[PDB]
Amino acid sequence: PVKVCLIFAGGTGMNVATKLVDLGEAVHCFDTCDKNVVDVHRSVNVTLTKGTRGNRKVILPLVRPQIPALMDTIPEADFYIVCYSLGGGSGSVLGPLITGQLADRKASFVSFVVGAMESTDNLGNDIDTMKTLEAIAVNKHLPIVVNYVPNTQGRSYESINDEIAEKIRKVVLLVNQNHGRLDVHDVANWVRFTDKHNYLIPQVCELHIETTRKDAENVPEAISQLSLYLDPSKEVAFGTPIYRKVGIMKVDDLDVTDDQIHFVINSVGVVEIMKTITDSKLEMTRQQSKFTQRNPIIDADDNVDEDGMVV
């Protein structure tokens, strides 16, 4: 198995991938067409589904039978990262289907998902995709751990994509197997926390990636925590998580970007994430339902022919 396999789906996933092409063979991209394929993608894996050239209900029956074929192109790995938009039609279908397959592999993985906010279609998709991940968490009895990134009004997709790529790199660093005290089994039991803590409920959880003790301590109701430290003198057993582990980073590790990084998993924040999306959609739909249009400028006295000609 490789150390980590990175999986990207849909346009948003393709776009984020462009920022990670230096990871090469470890990167696997999937989409239903080539609208988002650019030259830099030659450096990574790209697979497009057949017969599929925004509506998830339409895309699902077309792509479902192809999933096994997609999975054969994804090597066995010690950890996976999955990335896509919750709000489109392709990423939000391919992403969760592949995620289900990773759960069947008994894999350790996290996802980076985008809350798209343009339209009631985006918002409806966001809701259905979050519900999808919840259903998968239940059906596979496994936490589905996601770093949720909302497209906040006024912020460029470029900016958001940059932030996501930088977080993905921290996870790639986390799982690089080069840290003192930190095992592949330690990582597995961090993210698959229900395996050994059977009294906990598998569900959609959030991943919070923080670079200070203060920020990490402020994650509410933390369930499972992993901390990396460059200066082992700064290690402090803070917070109240159920599961906690620490790794010591190496100063000659060129990928070490920060002095300490905390990866905190909780789930209480998902309620507010859903509420924000549904309230936004309600407000947009209120406006749509309030919109009115004039009466017709034709009526029963008008002689209309088969082609719509009034002469």
Ligand X SMILES: Nc1nc2c(ncn2[C@@H]2O[C@H](COP(=O)(O)OP(=O)(O)O)[C@@H](O)[C@H]2O)c(=O)[nH]1
Contact positions toward ligand X, by CB under 6 A?
Answer: 10-12, 15, 54, 85, 87-92, 114, 116, 118, 122, 151, 157, 160-161
Do the annotations mark residue 178 as ligand-binding? no
115 binds, among ligand X, Mg ion, none (CB under 5 to 8 A by kind): none
For residue 74, how many other CB atoms are within 10 A of its CB?
Answer: 18
Is the distance from CB of 77 to CB of 3 less than 8 angstroms? yes
264 binds, among Mg ion, ligand X, none (CB under 5 to 8 A by kind): none
Is the distance from CB of 32 to CB of 48 less than 8 angstroms? yes
- 110/226 with CB nearer ligand X: 110
232 binds, among Mg ion, ligand X, none (CB under 5 to 8 A by kind): none
Strands 80-85 and 243-248 come out as: unpaired
Distance (Å, whole) CA 249 – CA 223:
23
Do the annotations mark residue 12 as ligand-binding? yes
- 158/235 with CB nearer ligand X: 158
Full strand arrangement of the beta sheet holding 5-9? 45-48, 27-31, 5-9, 80-85, 109-115, 144-150, 204-210, 260-266, 224-229, 243-248
Is the distance from CB of 95 to CB of 13 less than 8 angstroms? yes
Q: What is the largest CA-CA distance in the chain?
A: 89
- 90/111 with CB nearer Mg ion: 90
Min dist. Cβ of residue 14 to Mg ion (A)? 8
Residues in region 74-113 near Mg ion by CB under 5 A: 90
Interaction of residue 11 with Mg ion, rule CB under 5 A: yes
Site for Mg ion, rule CB under 5 A: 11, 90
| Residue list, annotated binding site for GTP | 11-12, 89-91, 161
Q: Residues within the annotated binding site?
A: 11-12, 89-91, 161
